[PDB]
Design brief:
15% strand; 316 residues; protease; Peptidase_M4; Elastase, domain 1; signal; binds calcium ion; Neutral Protease, domain 2; 5-stranded mixed β-sheet; alpha+beta; metalloprotease
Length: 316
Amino acid sequence: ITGTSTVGVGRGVLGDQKNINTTYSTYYYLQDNTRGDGIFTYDAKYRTTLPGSLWADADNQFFASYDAPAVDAHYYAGVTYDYYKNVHNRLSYDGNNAAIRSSVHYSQGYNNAFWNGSEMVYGDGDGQTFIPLSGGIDVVAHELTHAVTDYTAGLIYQNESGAINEAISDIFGTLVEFYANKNPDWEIGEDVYTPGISGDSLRSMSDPAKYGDPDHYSKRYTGTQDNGGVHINSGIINKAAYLISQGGTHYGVSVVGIGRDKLGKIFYRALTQYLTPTSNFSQLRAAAVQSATDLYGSTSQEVASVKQAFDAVGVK
Ligand SMILES: [Ca+2]
Ligand SMILES: [Ca+2]
Ligand SMILES: [Ca+2]
Ligand SMILES: [Ca+2]
Ligand SMILES: [Ca+2]
């Protein structure tokens, strides 16, 4: 809606207070006109038809329990936009300030989130296994980073190729979580996952096998569940990353970390330059070898560490 940019206040999923850019035209809208061609947030009203209705509000205060997941979807699409602009000098997922649309209250008891080739989607979960999934900034940015990915390298959603893609969302997932900086970790989804069990998560970058996910190529899933185990074999790539950023001996291979900012650099470059639709694990390394090699010279510690991490994950 054409209207007046203002700033509202509301309560997030974890019940934390934060401001959010709204749009005033009769109603206040969840429409942020300050980041590219707009961040709009929608109400799917528990249905499964999208996007739903551009959320509207009569006071610009969002402290209702129902507004919780919107607030946080709007707010964290923002931060993620900023992340990619500020850190990677990139304008929205398409690189040309496309609108980031998001819908909340998707279906009833929907314990998942997604990017549908055109918008993120979040369900309120079931209040056992999940709470409103947008509650988690890694949930949010992972998904938005599916868009980035579906406009850049276009990594197919299946087998080894799908696993990089999901891994890509898990790596920048953590890199926006660390951007935003509040109790940031290398786990996936700890803030919206199992309310009433404390300290677990969907996946572990530090230690994939913690939750049964693979941490070495050898130990990789060859079946067809989960579309070739895209969510399963992403750990191999994830521990490489964790390893590349943080260092550590893994299966007897030692790794000198190089930090996060160089993590993202090396991985963004690679996404945006060298990875194609069908890039398996062996060509990611090639991508990350060559990306660092560019961004840091062919004998840097950087180039070595990436070799370290992949060697560590068994990826030849
Ligand atoms: Ca209100
Ligand atoms: Ca946390
Ligand atoms: Ca996390
Ligand atoms: Ca939990
Ligand atoms: Ca699993």
